[PDB]
Amino acid sequence: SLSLIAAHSHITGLGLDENLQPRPTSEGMVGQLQARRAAGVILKMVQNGTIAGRAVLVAGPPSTGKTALAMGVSQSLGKDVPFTAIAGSEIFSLELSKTEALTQAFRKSIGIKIKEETELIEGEVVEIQIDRSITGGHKQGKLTIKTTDMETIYELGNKMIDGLTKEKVLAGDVISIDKASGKITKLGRSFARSRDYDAMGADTRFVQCPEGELQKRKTVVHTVSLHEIDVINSRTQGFLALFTGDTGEIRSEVRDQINTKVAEWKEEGKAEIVPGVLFIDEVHMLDIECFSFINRALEDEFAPIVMMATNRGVSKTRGTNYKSPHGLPLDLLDRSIIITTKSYNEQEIKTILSIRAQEEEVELSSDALDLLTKTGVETSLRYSSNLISVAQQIAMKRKNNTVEVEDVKRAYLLFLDSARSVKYVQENESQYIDDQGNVQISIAK
Amino acid sequence: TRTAAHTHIKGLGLDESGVAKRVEGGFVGQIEAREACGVIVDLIKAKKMSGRAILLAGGPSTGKTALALAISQELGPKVPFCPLVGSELYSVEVKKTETLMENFRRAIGLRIKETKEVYEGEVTELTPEDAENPLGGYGKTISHVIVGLKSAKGTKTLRLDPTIYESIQREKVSIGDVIYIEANTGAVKRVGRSDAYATEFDLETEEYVPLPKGEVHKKKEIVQDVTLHDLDVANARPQGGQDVISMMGQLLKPKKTEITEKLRQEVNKVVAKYIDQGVAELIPGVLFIDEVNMLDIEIFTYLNKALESNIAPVVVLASNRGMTTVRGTEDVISPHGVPPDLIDRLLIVRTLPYDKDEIRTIIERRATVERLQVESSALDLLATMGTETSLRYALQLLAPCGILAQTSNRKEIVVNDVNEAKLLFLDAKRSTKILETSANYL
Amino acid sequence: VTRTAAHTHIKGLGLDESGVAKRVEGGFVGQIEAREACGVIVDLIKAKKMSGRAILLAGGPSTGKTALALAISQELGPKVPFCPLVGSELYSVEVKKTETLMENFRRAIGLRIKETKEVYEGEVTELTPEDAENKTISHVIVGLKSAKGTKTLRLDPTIYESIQREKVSIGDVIYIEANTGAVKRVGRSDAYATEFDLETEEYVPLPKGEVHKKKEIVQDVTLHDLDVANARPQGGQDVISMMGQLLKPKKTEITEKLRQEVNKVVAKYIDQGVAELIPGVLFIDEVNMLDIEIFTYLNKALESNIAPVVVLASNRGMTTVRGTEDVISPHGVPPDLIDRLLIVRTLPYDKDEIRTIIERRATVERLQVESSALDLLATMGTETSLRYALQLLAPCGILAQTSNRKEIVVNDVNEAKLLFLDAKRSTKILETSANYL
Amino acid sequence: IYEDLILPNYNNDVDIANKLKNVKFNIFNPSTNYELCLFLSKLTGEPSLNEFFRVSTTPLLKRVIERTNGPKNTDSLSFKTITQELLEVTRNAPSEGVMASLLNVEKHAYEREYLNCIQRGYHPNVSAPPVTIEVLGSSHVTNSINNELFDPLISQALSDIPAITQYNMHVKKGIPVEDFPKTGLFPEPLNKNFSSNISMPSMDRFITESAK
Numbered sequence A: 001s002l003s004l005i006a007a008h009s010h011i012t013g014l015g016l017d018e019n020l021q022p023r024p025t026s027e028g029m030v031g032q033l034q035a036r037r038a039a040g041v042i043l044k045m046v047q048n049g050t051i052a053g054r055a056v057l058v059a060g061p062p063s064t065g066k067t068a069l070a071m072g073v074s075q076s077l078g079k080d081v082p083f084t085a086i087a088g089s090e091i092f093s094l095e096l097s098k099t100e101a102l103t104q105a106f107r108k109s110i111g112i113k114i115k116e117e118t119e120l121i122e123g124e125v126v127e128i129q130i131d132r133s134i135t136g137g138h139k140q141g142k143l144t145i146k147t148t149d150m151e152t153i154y155e156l157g158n159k160m161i162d163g164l165t166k167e168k169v170l171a172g173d174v175i176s177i178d179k180a181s182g183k184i185t186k187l188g189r190s191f192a193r194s195r196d197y198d199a200m201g202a203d204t205r206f207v208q209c210p211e212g213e214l215q216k217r218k219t220v221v222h223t224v225s226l227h228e229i230d231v232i233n234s235r236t237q238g239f240l241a242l243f244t245g246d247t248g249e250i251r252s253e254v255r256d257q258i259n260t261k262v263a264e265w266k267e268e269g270k271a272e273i274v275p276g277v278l279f280i281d282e283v284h285m286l287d288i289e290c291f292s293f294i295n296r297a298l299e300d301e302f303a304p305i306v307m308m309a310t311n312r313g314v315s316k317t318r319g320t321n322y323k324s325p326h327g328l329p330l331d332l333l334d335r336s337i338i339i340t341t342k343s344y345n346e347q348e349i350k351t352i353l354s355i356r357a358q359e360e361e362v363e364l365s366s367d368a369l370d371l372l373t374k375t376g377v378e379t380s381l382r383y384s385s386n387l388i389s390v391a392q393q394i395a396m397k398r399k400n401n402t403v404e405v406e407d408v409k410r411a412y413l414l415f416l417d418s419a420r421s422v423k424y425v426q427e428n429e430s431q432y433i434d435d436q437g438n439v440q441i442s443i444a445k
Numbered sequence B: 001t002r003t004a005a006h007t008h009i010k011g012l013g014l015d016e017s018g019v020a021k022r023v024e025g026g027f028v029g030q031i032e033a034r035e036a037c038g039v040i041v042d043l044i045k046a047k048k049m050s051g052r053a054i055l056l057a058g059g060p061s062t063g064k065t066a067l068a069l070a071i072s073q074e075l076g077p078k079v080p081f082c083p084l085v086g087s088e089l090y091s092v093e094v095k096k097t098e099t100l101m102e103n104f105r106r107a108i109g110l111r112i113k114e115t116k117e118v119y120e121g122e123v124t125e126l127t128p129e130d131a132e133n134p135l136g137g138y139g140k141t142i143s144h145v146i147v148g149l150k151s152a153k154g155t156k157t158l159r160l161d162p163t164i165y166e167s168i169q170r171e172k173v174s175i176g177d178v179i180y181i182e183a184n185t186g187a188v189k190r191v192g193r194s195d196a197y198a199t200e201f202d203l204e205t206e207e208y209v210p211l212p213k214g215e216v217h218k219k220k221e222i223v224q225d226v227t228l229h230d231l232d233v234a235n236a237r238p239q240g241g242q243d244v245i246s247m248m249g250q251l252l253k254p255k256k257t258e259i260t261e262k263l264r265q266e267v268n269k270v271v272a273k274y275i276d277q278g279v280a281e282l283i284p285g286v287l288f289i290d291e292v293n294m295l296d297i298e299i300f301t302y303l304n305k306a307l308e309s310n311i312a313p314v315v316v317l318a319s320n321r322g323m324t325t326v327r328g329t330e331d332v333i334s335p336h337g338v339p340p341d342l343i344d345r346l347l348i349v350r351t352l353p354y355d356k357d358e359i360r361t362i363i364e365r366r367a368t369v370e371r372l373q374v375e376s377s378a379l380d381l382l383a384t385m386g387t388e389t390s391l392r393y394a395l396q397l398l399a400p401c402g403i404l405a406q407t408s409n410r411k412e413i414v415v416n417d418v419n420e421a422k423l424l425f426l427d428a429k430r431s432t433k434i435l436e437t438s439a440n441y442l
Numbered sequence C: 001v002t003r004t005a006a007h008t009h010i011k012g013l014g015l016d017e018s019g020v021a022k023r024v025e026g027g028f029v030g031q032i033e034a035r036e037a038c039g040v041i042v043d044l045i046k047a048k049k050m051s052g053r054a055i056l057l058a059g060g061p062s063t064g065k066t067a068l069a070l071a072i073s074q075e076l077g078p079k080v081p082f083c084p085l086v087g088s089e090l091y092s093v094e095v096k097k098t099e100t101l102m103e104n105f106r107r108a109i110g111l112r113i114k115e116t117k118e119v120y121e122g123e124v125t126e127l128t129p130e131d132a133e134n135k136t137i138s139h140v141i142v143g144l145k146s147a148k149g150t151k152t153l154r155l156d157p158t159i160y161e162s163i164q165r166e167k168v169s170i171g172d173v174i175y176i177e178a179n180t181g182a183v184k185r186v187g188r189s190d191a192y193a194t195e196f197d198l199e200t201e202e203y204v205p206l207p208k209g210e211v212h213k214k215k216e217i218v219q220d221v222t223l224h225d226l227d228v229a230n231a232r233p234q235g236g237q238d239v240i241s242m243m244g245q246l247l248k249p250k251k252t253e254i255t256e257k258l259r260q261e262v263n264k265v266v267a268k269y270i271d272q273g274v275a276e277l278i279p280g281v282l283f284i285d286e287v288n289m290l291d292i293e294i295f296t297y298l299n300k301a302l303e304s305n306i307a308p309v310v311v312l313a314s315n316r317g318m319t320t321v322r323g324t325e326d327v328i329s330p331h332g333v334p335p336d337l338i339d340r341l342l343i344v345r346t347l348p349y350d351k352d353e354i355r356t357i358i359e360r361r362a363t364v365e366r367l368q369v370e371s372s373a374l375d376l377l378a379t380m381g382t383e384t385s386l387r388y389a390l391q392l393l394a395p396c397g398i399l400a401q402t403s404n405r406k407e408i409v410v411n412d413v414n415e416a417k418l419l420f421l422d423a424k425r426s427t428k429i430l431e432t433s434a435n436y437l
Numbered sequence D: 001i002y003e004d005l006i007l008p009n010y011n012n013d014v015d016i017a018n019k020l021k022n023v024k025f026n027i028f029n030p031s032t033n034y035e036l037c038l039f040l041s042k043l044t045g046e047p048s049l050n051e052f053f054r055v056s057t058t059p060l061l062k063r064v065i066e067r068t069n070g071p072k073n074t075d076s077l078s079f080k081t082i083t084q085e086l087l088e089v090t091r092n093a094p095s096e097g098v099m100a101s102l103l104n105v106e107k108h109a110y111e112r113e114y115l116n117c118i119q120r121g122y123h124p125n126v127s128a129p130p131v132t133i134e135v136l137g138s139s140h141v142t143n144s145i146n147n148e149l150f151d152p153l154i155s156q157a158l159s160d161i162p163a164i165t166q167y168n169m170h171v172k173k174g175i176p177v178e179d180f181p182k183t184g185l186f187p188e189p190l191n192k193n194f195s196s197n198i199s200m201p202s203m204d205r206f207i208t209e210s211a212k
């Protein structure tokens, strides 16, 4: 809940029926009926999970809702399924090769689900006793772990003992042990013994004393993506590269052995695979090497459903010198099924502005809504979307809670758009630095 | 389980010493190409000749990758197979020539047979037995160590050399543990505690292995299969030592490094020595490089002499482009994106495009593999759309038809469903036709 | 005296509380519309509700868009974070360039934490560790003496070991912090100076205050410090060391995972009420220097859940965007990005605005200029550039001080014109001569 | 500079910000972030859940030195790759072994090419210590750079304890053997001639350096 009101914060999910048909307006998304139906078909294909390596594409004019549909399918997919949304430019990295960066993004998007049963024994410790006879009985001890309510006494073992004395344990530390595996968690000093020492150690932490039963039992589910197994299996202390990014081109035999282990681990039923969606926004900035690797990276059973976006028409493919449709070569467009969005009329525009106005908590008069509708039709959707907040700021500077037509007029006057900036640049070209670098800095001549 | 635009290829479907059956192995058509791949597979399974190369020429969505997977499946899992795309080689960590050379050495497989004389079981009693005349000024004088091992239907007393005692004392080996030793080395490896002796029932850390099966004395014949790249990367990184440098190398990120010819030559020398001993067996495996039109000219220049080397295996090349310029040079227009010096070295297999009947048989084969039930009329409509647009556009459209059939609670694929799913998901041709008539550069 | 800079006469936007901008206030003159727009977006940043708002400033050179950005940063206050930037430093050799963009994004967003500092100080009167073996001491009792009295302290064995690592004995003066548990020795006491006539031990007097001092501080951080404090590859900034480390760490790519967990911990500490999130301003100047890849990663990263209010500034007209060969666009900004931007224009000035600018600059840089010299400076500014007259204002002061005259006269301006040339006259002399001027 | 930037002070904020950025907000803290620690405990099979906080807050050389020989949990996702199994299966292996002789070519190249009797060919021209830092009027700087130049764990790790001393703690002082400060981690040079850069004047070079 650290987030703020972003552009896509109104999109709660794909507003569909039970038979995959969109509503006129529900769950955030307005209009785009055919594209939303296609995305719902895609979502059901993801949720079935029996088909691997499908490549789908979202093509349309700018500001028509392709990434809106992407955030819709991300929110409708829900958690515990790996969703990855990368850009075109994130592939180009200096010390990590582009093709292997595609492999990282592909293996980050397919998960494997593991269930674990825990037997948590958490409570404040009181006493650890010495039952050994010159370490006879493998350094046996007695434990006096207590919660707030009940207290009990256990007997420990040699591994358990040097595990605790490897840690900084003494009376008062909130400690935790699994009954089955024996994993040790030293949370810190109990808060009741706060005033034992006036000065405390750096690593010392104050935790509340646990309340209730000691031997609580809970089952947790684990959803881990297939790239993390390669991360922890490539190095010795490999968990740092999960957070610092220094994976550094994991070799192919590690991926092969991990795929074999995942097949074995799913064959015995102790784990199952959860496929996800690799969303590649702005796919037109991949060169021919990335597309040649994408074409063969979708023929493995461990391949997510790749969804792409492109606002370019027939444009130049980067890395080559010939025109091509969608900014993509024809061999990639052979494999892809294309979902097409379309432009909006005035009604879709005014409903989208009404939703975005309620999302940013701005109350609107009807005349201001009609003026913003006309401006959204004329210039662009996103300019009229952006005008609402600055109109609200002008309103509170006028000591009015709501926005009238006057605030929208003033915000349209102060803040420009694309077309007016184009006109006002072409009017006064001499004052601006240009492609030839010549400018007249002086005012009067 | 999972459909991944493949897996109906169960093999070539070639008959023995003759023509291919038309619909065997999941393959439809391509009689000449499948005969050529059968000849190549026979030559590879002969394992006589090394440093050959085959290029597959044909248009998009023809089945060259399916031919390569057919080769790998007909070779068997004992034969290594390294599928590779042409863009894999450009690594910003090591030079491209070393990347291609290590992908060459990954394809060569080695199998070694041996025997393992081990004693395994659960220790019931270990005694650091003393000695007469115990030297002088010494805490102990161990003549020998007697250990009593217990296994399933087996129990032995082993009289060991004294040097196993410090390994026992280091590895915390006590009574109530399952251990696993080796005869000739005499180094103890503690598996853990026995399953029955979970005595500290309140809290425990060490996992309890079950009591081991079989006799206490086993002479197994473990056969392990490795690649030559495995041996090279094992010799290259420093094993043993544990003296700062190796430990820092283990903790830090591994770096791909230019493996010199001396290491590969020593590896080939010792491998040839144990081949001539008769205990090891060497088995070459194919290497598949797809989109070979996209390698730079210097990669082809290195491949000209890497192909001529002694130990490098066969390599299968795939290209779809025709009259084009080689990447990395200005105006060398050459067939398939391969420079003409390499073209004389390699053999070319041409794959032909299909027609309506092959398309519909491929579509129904993919539907049976996907476990989708589709009628004959929808099969004919999908065949006509596949001939009209492309094979892959029909093949990837089967699954949305299955979803749309599931939405209306129907098992059968019906013509209105394929028309509707066509309306949802456009073809690249019709999208391009939208693009030329688009107002906002769609 | 203080050093005058190019923007040290700017203090605020100078708009009134009603939103109207006064003509001469806050170190600004003219530029009414852009100042009003900047005041509105200042109120928008102070509202602290939306993420990813983007503003592009437009206008020619010497229009004061950098002055507007600094006026925004001064109107917000020192508490609100501000990350000024030029487009050319996004390109790096150590880490990839979109990663540098995301690093600056996380640099702009800031956090505010309250904290108490409790300090024990004085001479070690007694030191007696109680072992209570069951080697490993149970605890230690420590007496600290100052001029206002003494106290005694009870400590855990860890800080006792850290005390042992500062070579602390009886008579030393130490620094004890209650929360962090850091120890710093100061030296032996002044009362123990004459044990030997000359010894290496540094002798320091007793603290004349009390032993126990407490104060409350407000630790102001950004999210970048947070997600670099645990994105550490080699491990080990917790040691405080002078000499260089064995491995020099590089700037590394920061995964989405660690940013998500940092967001989780920051949100937990916010809901505990110890922290207060504050959005900031990321001001990237010279937007034309940005590559197309950074433009589209910016578009993509403008819609994230947490993102600052980015202000952009450029001077170019219909120019080709950097990195592509054919895409022409206003201000060097590609159309997909320029749809998201709200463009505010900055207009050039007439002669009276230039004269008032030069007068105010002469006041802040501590000179005194006669009125006719001001008229010549204004005519020179209209003829050539504002910046040429503004930079020539000070060598007039050097020449006036040279002749032991506090006032600037017209002859000083003429002499500085002979001494230093503008771009246009030097371009003319460049054109007239042949052999490389 | 030292007394206002590096050392803690009543008007300085070094220790407060250090703790606030390294303990209060470390994402491996089990007191605040349990599920992430349990996540990595499931992945790497670590017996203790504070180990990630220990690794994240330890210098690299120190973390290298205290290398733990304890095996992990057996339900982990740490699947030992075939190269590690190859290296561990030959860790103490005899000669005349098929997997033994494949995995040591450097010892074969050593013994075949007679590298045990080669001579030093290069010595550096100038050798220097690290550049001394001289702060006037403080003993804390002297203590700090003397500790950093001669850290007893790092110096003792690049060292060896004498044998009669190991007698003295192991028998006479009764110190357990595993509680010794670890030694012998300095890398072995290639030969006895490669140990030190000083070259003695050889009699045979006097014999052979003259024309007559």
Ligand SMILES: Nc1ncnc2c1ncn2[C@@H]1O[C@H](COP(=O)(O)OP(=O)(O)O)[C@@H](O)[C@H]1O
Pocket: A007, A008, A028, A029, A030, A031, A032, A061, A062, A063, A064, A065, A066, A067, A068, A069, A311, A352, A355, A356, A381, A382, A385
């Ligand atoms: N179906 C929709 N419902 C509501 N808002 C939408 C819809 N489609 C687009 N938007 C608006 O468009 C903006 C983003 O559109 P986007 O998908 O980024 O355009 P493009 O597809 O050109 O990238 C968002 O601010 C969102 O409010």
Ligand SMILES: Nc1ncnc2c1ncn2[C@@H]1O[C@H](COP(=O)(O)OP(=O)(O)O)[C@@H](O)[C@H]1O
Pocket: B005, B006, B026, B027, B028, B029, B030, B058, B059, B060, B061, B062, B063, B064, B065, B066, B362, B391, B392, B395
């Ligand atoms: N002769 C064939 N028999 C059966 N399936 C085929 C045949 N040719 C192609 N296919 C199928 O068509 C799909 C696309 O072929 P593909 O391998 O992409 O062609 P190419 O090798 O030219 O890239 C593959 O899933 C493949 O299984």
Ligand SMILES: Nc1ncnc2c1ncn2[C@@H]1O[C@H](COP(=O)(O)OP(=O)(O)O)[C@@H](O)[C@H]1O
Pocket: C006, C007, C009, C010, C027, C028, C029, C030, C031, C060, C061, C062, C063, C064, C065, C066, C067, C357
């Ligand atoms: N309206 C104004 N009032 C006062 N000073 C101004 C005004 N506009 C510009 N300046 C001054 O002009 C100087 C240079 O302007 P600058 O921001 O460098 O121009 P640009 O916008 O091209 O970068 C600044 O130090 C600023 O103080």
